[PDB]
Design a protein around this ligand. Sequence first.
Ligand SMILES: [Mg+2]
Ligand SMILES: [Mg+2]
Lengths: 130, 320, 71
Amino acid sequence: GRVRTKTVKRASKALIEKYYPKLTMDFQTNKRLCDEIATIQSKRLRNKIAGYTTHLMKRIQKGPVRGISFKLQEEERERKDQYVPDVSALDLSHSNDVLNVDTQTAELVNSLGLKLPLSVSSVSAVRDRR
Amino acid sequence: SSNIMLVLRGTLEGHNGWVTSLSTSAAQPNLLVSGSRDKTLISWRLTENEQQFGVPVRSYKGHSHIVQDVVVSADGNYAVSASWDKTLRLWNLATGNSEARFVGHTGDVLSVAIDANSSKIISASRDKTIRVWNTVGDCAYVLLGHTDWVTKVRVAPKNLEDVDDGRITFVSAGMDKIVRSWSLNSYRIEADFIGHNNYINVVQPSPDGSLAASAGKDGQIYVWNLKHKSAFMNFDAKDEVFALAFSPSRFWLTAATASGIKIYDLENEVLIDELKPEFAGYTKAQDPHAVSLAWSADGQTLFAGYTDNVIRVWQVMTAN
Amino acid sequence: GHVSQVYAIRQAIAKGLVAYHQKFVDEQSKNELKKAFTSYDRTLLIADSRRPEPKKFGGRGARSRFQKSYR
RNA sequence: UUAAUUGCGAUAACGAACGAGACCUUAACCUACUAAAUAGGGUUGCUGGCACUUGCCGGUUGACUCUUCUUAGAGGGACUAU
Ligand SMILES: [Mg+2]
Ligand SMILES: [Mg+2]
């Protein structure tokens, strides 16, 4: 029945989020790091904290996990977010500069007073039986 | 050019923790002292008979905690062990008993260095300090200048410096993200080296003593000149380079990446070979990486101490 | 007591042999002795960890209890 | 899921407090440190006996030396570690 209650989990989360570059995969090195960079009163709690910190580090190494965040992961997320394709996904770059619309939206374009390159196609009002 | 292949020839089983460090003496080529996480050193006698490349000779108990760095003496009869109990131990390689117990570091010792002759012991510890001891056991100097842990200190061998100087030059590095040079007689500072993005994990001067190779977390290996005090080159390992080692014969750098062992050919500035042993029953995400590297005296065999508690030796077998 | 002393002598002799072989003989001999030993009654080199449980009030034994009346 | 209102979480709930846990005592493990005629051991004395080969089992508050066990301080050690 080892569940590692609030204190160790929160402390390890903060430890990772403030000291990821210094943390390692090894339990003993992270134990010394916990001794130096954090004032854990007892030593059993220190050991539990280092153990859960190592476990969370291993999970992070496997991949990105919920809850915890740090400078490197947030910067990588922002870099992936800033991705914008140079090629266009709109304005009829595909389908040889032709968009497929039915009659109704064609009349919409017409009555709007605008002339856009359209391509009429009936929508076969028969509906699928699903 | 130099179509040199290296093949694993033996496995030195017998340790019970990660083989953290290795050492070999030039005078005695068939002896290899290895320290592990099992708080014990082991002396190995190398046999050129069959599958096993060596034979354990003596286990050196007496260390309470992790044994990090191991250094053999120049003559090949004494070995200095640095452990995680804040103490250093000098061992007779034949008797098996300890001679001296160096005490004084307030943090667990991470690395130790032997003098060029048998005069001084240089030790690096987590207490941000370096200590210079006699062979008796007392501490002669307390070198400061590092604001964080010092992980590696290995002496730059004096090759042809003028004739003779009686001056002892070495390098030091750790989590201060710097590399420092030190000169001894007196016993004061020398030039600096600031190139690492992350903190330095290990440094190792070249066998001649004019090239210093440093490595860190980001896998950014730097090569510097000490007698010229300038950068020599820079590569990226793109993994966690735990340890690195020059080679006596070839102009090479072995690097213990978190994925395998790279070898960099220095003259051509291009890596040539990669070493990844074949384990069984794993998930390819936690394969046991190398933590200790040591070439033979001639430059014919390579010893790698892994986290799987095993020493593996790659013998150089040039298949034309 | 008697049998506890006997097991103590067993462990003392085995550990003395192993320690002597490690100290002055050879590594291989020591590991061979350990393989011969630990493959038989692991206690031969490892001290037993089981030891008596402190007694508690309300029970004449360390874990037993008194009888209940109930009426 | 946990021994646990212990956690992972989902969420008109958000942050918190007591309890549990943490924490102390005790039981381990320390041929690593400090040491000890109010604890033990070795060598050597001075002796007893038997063996006769230099060895065995003893006695002595005679000396030198050591701390493995016995002690108790600072520490290490396990955190479900791989
Ligand atoms: Mg009873
Ligand atoms: Mg003791």
